[PDB]
Design a protein around this ligand. Structure first.
Ligand SMILES: [Ca+2]
Lengths: 145, 78
């Protein structure tokens, strides 16, 4: 279901990592591209990211694994269920909602905290009626196309 | 085993999930925002995306990998 050209777009992105052109993305090439953009991942973080798509076990990413990951994004069934399970962790009522203030409070105080502008763009992307409750499920339907 | 000390233990069995749960939402939102955020709605990114569309696709590929790691670490807290 992928056009011959959007496959060529992912091949162009793959080749940016795979500089030596040997068909694999190592931690060296993945981290080099990440750090040229100003990111600073640890070596363990590079291994964890590669292990999520390395279906062979040699510790590298090849192009078939790459375009499968790029085509899937978050549209899979497992992502939709897990992301919602993460939202329910902050749902006391069990309603499928969470107050816009508690969502803002959780996003800016836990884990990789969002900036003030990040969480403001998230609250704008969800819609709020009445008390101030987002329907976080129709939110994960939006994120997972 | 006996009474309340489970209700204050069940609080903590669950409290170690709130950080990986937030990380999953934050990684998912940052991945979703890659193709809709105002951060990319500037003349600089439009031109950058015209001469080299691979740069934005690389940024997306990195965010997808980070979403997958985050989704795993949250599943490992179940
Ligand atoms: Ca290589």
């Amino acid at each position: 279901q992928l056009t011959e050209e959007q496959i060529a777009e992912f091949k162009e992105a793959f080749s940016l990592f795979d500089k030596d052109g040997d068909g694999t993305i190592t931690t060296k090439e993945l981290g080099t591209v990440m750090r040229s953009l100003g990111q600073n991942p640890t070596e363990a973080e590079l291994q964890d990211m590669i292990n999520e798509v390395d279906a062979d076990g040699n510790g590298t990413i090849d192009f078939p694994e790459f375009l499968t990951m790029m085509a899937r994004k978050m549209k899979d069934t497992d992502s939709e269920e897990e992301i919602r399970e993460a939202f329910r962790v902050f749902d006391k009522d069990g309603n499928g909602y969470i107050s816009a203030a508690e969502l803002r409070h959780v996003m800016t105080n836990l884990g990789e905290k969002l900036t003030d502008e990040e969480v403001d763009e998230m609250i704008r992307e969800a819609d709020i009626d009445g008390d101030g409750q987002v329907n976080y499920e129709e939110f994960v339907q939006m994120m997972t196309a | 085993g006996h009474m309340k000390v489970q209700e204050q233990h069940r609080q903590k069995h669950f409290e170690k999930r709130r950080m990986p749960a937030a990380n999953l939402i934050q990684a998912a939102w940052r991945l979703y925002s890659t193709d809709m955020s105002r951060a990319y709605l500037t003349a600089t990114w439009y031109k950058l995306d015209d001469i080299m569309p691979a740069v934005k696709t690389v940024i997306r590929s990195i965010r997808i990998l980070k979403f997958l790691v985050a989704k795993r670490k949250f599943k490992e807290t179940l």
